[PDB]
Curated annotation (Swiss-Prot), chain A:
Name of this protein: Carboxysome assembly protein CcmM
Gene transcribed to yield this protein: ccmM
An example Gene Ontology CC term for this record: carboxysome
Segment of the intact protein contained: 16 to 182 of 539
Primary role: Functions as a scaffold protein for the assembly of beta-carboxysomes, initiates carboxysome assembly by coalescing RuBisCO (ribulose bisphosphate carboxylase, rbcL-rbcS). Produced as a full-length (M58) and a shorter form (M35); both forms are required for correct carboxysome assembly and growth. The short form is more abundant. Despite its strong similarity to gamma-class carbonic anhydrase (CA) it does not have detectable CA activity. Beta-carboxysome assembly initiates when soluble RuBisCO is condensed into a liquid matrix in a pre-carboxysome by the RbcS-like domains of probably both CcmM58 and CcmM35. CcmN interacts with the N-terminus of CcmM58, and then recruits the CcmK2 major shell protein plus other less abundant CcmK proteins via CcmN's encapsulation peptide. Shell formation requires CcmK proteins and CcmO. CcmL caps the otherwise elongated carboxysome. Once fully encapsulated carboxysomes are formed, they migrate within the cell probably via interactions with the cytoskeleton.
Post-translational modification: Protease inhibitors do not alter the appearance of M35. In isolated carboxysomes M35 is 4-5 fold more abundant.
Similarity comment text for this entry: Belongs to the gamma-class carbonic anhydrase family.
Keyword Repeat appears in the UniProt entry: yes
Originating species: Synechococcus elongatus (strain ATCC 33912 / PCC 7942 / FACHB-805)
Free-text note on domains in this protein's UniProt record: In the N-terminus has a gamma-class carbonic anhydrase-like domain (CA), while the C-terminus has 3 repeats that are similar to the small subunit of RuBisCO (rbcS), called SSUL. The SSUL are connected by flexible linkers. The N-terminal domain forms a scaffold on which CA and maybe other carboxysomal proteins assemble, while the C-terminus binds RuBisCO. At least 2 SSUL domains are required for initiation of carboxysome assembly. Isolated reduced and oxidized CcmM35 binds holo-RuBisCO (RbcL(8)-RbcS(8)) but neither subunit octamer alone; RuBisCO has a higher affinity for reduced M35.
GO terms of biological process kind: carbon fixation; photosynthesis
Curated annotation (Swiss-Prot), chain B:
Protein's UniProt name: Carboxysome assembly protein CcmN
GO biological process, one term: photosynthesis
Induction section of the entry: Carboxysome size and components vary with growth conditions. When grown in ambient air at medium light (50 uE meter(-2) second(-1)) there are 74 units of this protein per carboxysome, the numbers decrease under low light and high CO(2), and increase under high light (at protein level).
Self-association state and partner proteins as the record states: Interacts with CcmM via the N-terminus of CcmN. Interacts with CcmK2 via the 18 C-terminal residues.
Disruption phenotype: Cells with a disrupted or mutated protein do not have carboxysomes, instead have less dense inclusions, do not grow in normal air. Targeted disruption do not grow normally in air but have wild-type growth in 3% CO(2), called a high-CO(2) requiring phenotype, HCR. Cells have a single polar aggregate instead of carboxysomes; RuBisCO localizes to polar spots consistent with the polar aggregates.
GO cellular component: carboxysome
Taxonomic source organism: Synechococcus elongatus (strain ATCC 33912 / PCC 7942 / FACHB-805) (Anacystis nidulans R2)
Keywords: Bacterial microcompartment, Carbon dioxide fixation, Carboxysome, Photosynthesis
Amino acid sequence: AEPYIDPAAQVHAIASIIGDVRIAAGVRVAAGVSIRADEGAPFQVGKESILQEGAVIHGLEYGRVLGDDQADYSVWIGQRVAITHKALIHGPAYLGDDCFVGFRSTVFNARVGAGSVIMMHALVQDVEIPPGRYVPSGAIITTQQQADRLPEVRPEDREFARHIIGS
Amino acid sequence: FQSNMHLPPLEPPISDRYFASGEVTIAADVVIAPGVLLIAEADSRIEIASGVCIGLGSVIHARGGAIIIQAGALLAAGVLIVGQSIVGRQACLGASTTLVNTSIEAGGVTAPGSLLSAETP
Amino acid sequence: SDRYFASGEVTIAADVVIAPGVLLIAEADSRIEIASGVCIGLGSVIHARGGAIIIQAGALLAAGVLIVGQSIVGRQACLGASTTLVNTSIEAGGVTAPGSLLSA
């Protein structure tokens, strides 16, 4: 089935959006962004999120997370979430409200609680990230030990993320 | 994971064309792979010199100034340049290099997966 | 789309598999040669500059390979993903780990 674009959402005409994807109001999909739900797996991108050029959202055929609307989703992106250039969000995945995912970083089969800041060239996999935690650039997080010991978002680090998107 | 193996995969193109948005001025002997994204904000421009090659999946995004790829510089697939950057004459950038407000000496070579990021110049 | 792009003196054997978005560019004084049975992975960029780049028989090049300058990639050698070779060569049966960088 087709995707649902909120009329109040701005989706570049050169972006590629395939399948059961839910684009909320005020959501900005940049040029060359790839969102693909060709498994019959639902995708939901919450309001006023920003997907930058080259970002990409894939989903596994099997696996889901629980959305805030009580539905099961392959991918649930919350509200005000930044997914930056060349970053990947794959498979069963949950990003909270006000999450940041830096350049060329991957979130796959994982839970990222709200307000979290993920930097650049990083992988988060197989973990439930606590709300409000910061993964450094280049980090590889696969054990729930590693998650538990993540720094909380320094009021500094959310400035860096607020510079990366400046609109 | 082996080196760069944690980084995202490198996806095929959908068109045989790349996409520019902003102020770009291109050199007749330049080779740009399909699906490369040259983006320049209103305060900004991208400048690519003679003999440059830009590989599959690369993204050049100029912000607060200019990105200048000088002549004979080469970018492997998925190189990402955000901010303002000058890539030296004859430079070579490994796959999935990231340069953020950082420049490259002429002839300098970047290991694949490299991450070079300064806050602001 | 499935296409690659070549420029300059590039000769390719008939049973070579070349992935999409590959660039095979040889400068004017220089050339590229690809023997038979070779596979060039997606997005790879090969650029001969001061002479020849020779990819010999049955070698495999993973995605995101970059070869610059002059080089011989030996018979049936295997180059890991994102390998980056600048003015350096690979023996026959040689192997590069992914993300490796050999440069002279």
